[PDB]
Design a protein around this nucleic acid. Sequence first.
RNA 1: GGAACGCCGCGGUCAGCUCGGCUGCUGCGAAGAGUCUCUGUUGUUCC
Length: 240
Amino acid sequence: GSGFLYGGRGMHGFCLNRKRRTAAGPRRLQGQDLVRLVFFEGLKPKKLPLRYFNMVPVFGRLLQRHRKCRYSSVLHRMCPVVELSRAAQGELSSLIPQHCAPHRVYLFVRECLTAVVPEELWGSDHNRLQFFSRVRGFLKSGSVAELMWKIKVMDCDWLKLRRTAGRFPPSELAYRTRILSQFLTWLLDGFVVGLVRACFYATESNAIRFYRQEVWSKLQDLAFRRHIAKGEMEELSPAQ
RNA sequence: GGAACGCCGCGGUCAGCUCGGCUGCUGCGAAGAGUCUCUGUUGUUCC
């Protein structure tokens, strides 16, 4: 659907870590793929219209930043672990979940947003902060496209087709807001919820609580890896 | 306020090519979304 409850099986599930259609092997997402995921639907075989085609570099940059973001490490920082006792260390420690205060799982999401989303996309710091505000509220509920704004459309140059700041008609402003709405919607509905659906088992009591079983979660990430690998092998290795 | 595409400003989430740029066709030019608030505007043209 588009909730973020009832799973923390790890970052291997995160949208930005899906691989594109294995035409002679499965490859990691390119800017053009992310663009198609945000503004069309990613499962568009045809070519991108020039306006969107010109934004393949920023989205490629987002992917880069995502790939260098160390989510595990930010998580550990913002959601510190309660130290169990020696004698609980090991198996029991991996059976017992670790709660993370809601404001803290928000702080995680906040810093990840800051890490991976290029600034050119925010347009203004004012736009970033307003969005964080929505995220803050989003993370407490269980909101609409129009409701998502004290957001300054003319701050985002990237919505332009050409970088000439000549006068534009109403129809443009509309088309610009639409594009921005689509991206901010994906940032909220795609990135944010993907994030918490990946790193936290979240549950509702009317407060959301966030749990985590890191080690078990990391084993899931690792097990995924060996699984898809065993898959490829079987497809390459001969009969008999 | 009604119109318009020659002038010039901004487009087409649309179509052809043998296609990341050409041309074909084609829209808009100061209000739009919410329900007073958020995002926005000098001056294209014609009466």
